[PDB]
Amino acid sequence: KPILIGLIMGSQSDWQTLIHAAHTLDALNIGYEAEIVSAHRTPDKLFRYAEQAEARGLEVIIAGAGGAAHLPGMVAAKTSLPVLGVPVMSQTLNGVDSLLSIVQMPAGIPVGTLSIGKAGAINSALFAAAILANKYPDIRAALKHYREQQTQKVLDNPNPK
Amino acid sequence: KPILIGLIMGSQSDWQTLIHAAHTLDALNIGYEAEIVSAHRTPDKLFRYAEQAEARGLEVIIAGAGGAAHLPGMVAAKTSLPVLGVPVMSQTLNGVDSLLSIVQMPAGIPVGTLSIGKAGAINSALFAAAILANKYPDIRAALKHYREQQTQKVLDNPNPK
Amino acid sequence: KPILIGLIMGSQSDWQTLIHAAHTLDALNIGYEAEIVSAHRTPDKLFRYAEQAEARGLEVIIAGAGGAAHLPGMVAAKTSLPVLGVPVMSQTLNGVDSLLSIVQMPAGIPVGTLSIGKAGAINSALFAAAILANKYPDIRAALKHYREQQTQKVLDNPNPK
Amino acid sequence: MKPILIGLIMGSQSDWQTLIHAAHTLDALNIGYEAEIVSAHRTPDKLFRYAEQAEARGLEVIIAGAGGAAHLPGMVAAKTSLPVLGVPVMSQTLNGVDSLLSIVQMPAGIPVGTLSIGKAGAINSALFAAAILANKYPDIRAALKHYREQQTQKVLDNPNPKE
Ligand SMILES: [Cl-]
Ligand SMILES: [Cl-]
Ligand SMILES: [Cl-]
Ligand SMILES: [Cl-]
Question: In chain D, at which end, N or C, are there fewer CB atoms within 10 A of the end residue's CB?
């Protein structure tokens, strides 16, 4: 598969969250690469990664970070590719710091932000798929099948007891 | 015993909370039906459920959901029956997202909102009973007896340990 | 020993917090009575308790409640004795609901509010002692000795290693 | 041996479970420090004496950690002109939100340089104290730059989260 998504994160611990994005992309048969890129510990690598993403064929970036989360916004500052932000749960503030430091970008440089935590990692993969589905009919077919199946599963299990 | 209450929730995991509503209704001998209805995964079923509730004889709907909780508000948009919202505790924000997404309805479509979590599930049943008690003398007697025995149990155990 | 403090709480579970007030009062040799008084389940008892507290010789009331905590405020509405409020930690909102429902009394009826949780229960006892110490030299001496011992204990143990 | 340049203080013994990580970082940087329990609420007189003596003793930075209604950093900054760093200790009831606001929201006139809630802020208080000292002490500047260079290279050497 062509590698269409860069799935990046500030630290190894963030992988416990963003692995769920990767699992969802695998389920949809969408090619991706997963890489640790730290805004704070590898700032020059962040610039290289963002600068070269478009030329390497990436079309969507999913960036996860926690706390004072600067990785998604700084990548969006350095590439015009759409950047999705996953707020990682933080130990002290339950990802509220993560959420506000990702979603509240001032006008001019956007980051499309998903839910705090695992839900947001899964939804970042589903949202990247929706973006790619406008271009790639096989991805659109895969996404619609995913949504149809998830709908049918709830319909066929209506009783909580 | 007529089925007067529809007890609905977005997902199977919500039942861990809304089962306490069901237990309370069973204690008051009030007929209900419990069903999984997802605003996000079964939107068409949500609309059909709300459209048909009155014709099926339901008089109150108790709807529980967590996170960005859209189930109560969309049911209230689609039936004129009173809809009670139970904010389910969320893992990341402790049901604060659930609470605000249910209670803060703009003017025009109301949802009567109860406490976050189990306390709100129990109180949604007691509140549905209070609604029904204006019309059904047997339910008024059951609710008054419940409240009197609840009061006496505290009075009968005045000393802590 | 004369009973100078009424130590009241809305439910048995609150005693896990307010027992630390009782312990502190025991250490200061201040007489108190501890009782379950529920704003929501025994409202008539709350009114009788408040009405009779002054004639009974009580001088300070410590009231603990969690969630939508109405017990301290309604006692303060029904007796002119100083009422101290202890916000009990809540399962869903970590006592933030408890704190705001106690401290934010509108002008006209005050509740002297202490910290959320165990720290506030201990401090409610110490503050009640501070109130009584204006009257009772034995209590003033006990409180000053408590404060002197806790200061000297920290001074005598300056090294965290 | 090492002259003591940092006073590392905290309101209670339980705060040491957080500030020990500041001590560990200063040990790694070979910076002389002294750790002490100084309680704004239980030893107010000692707080004033500690702050009054700090400059003459040769301390150049104070790291102060406290939780809840955290008054230790601000009152030390009120009583010495040395730079005071504040570490908000995570509180059991409010997760250090009370700690954070009672430290960082100082009115104009008396500053406290505030770090992250909890262990991250304890580590960063040590690194920030090193940055302050590095302007004056080239040995500490070299230790701090080496710490940063090593932590950068370690991430660069481990790019794949799947191992
Ligand atoms: Cl770098
Ligand atoms: Cl559907
Ligand atoms: Cl009563
Ligand atoms: Cl002192």
Answer: N
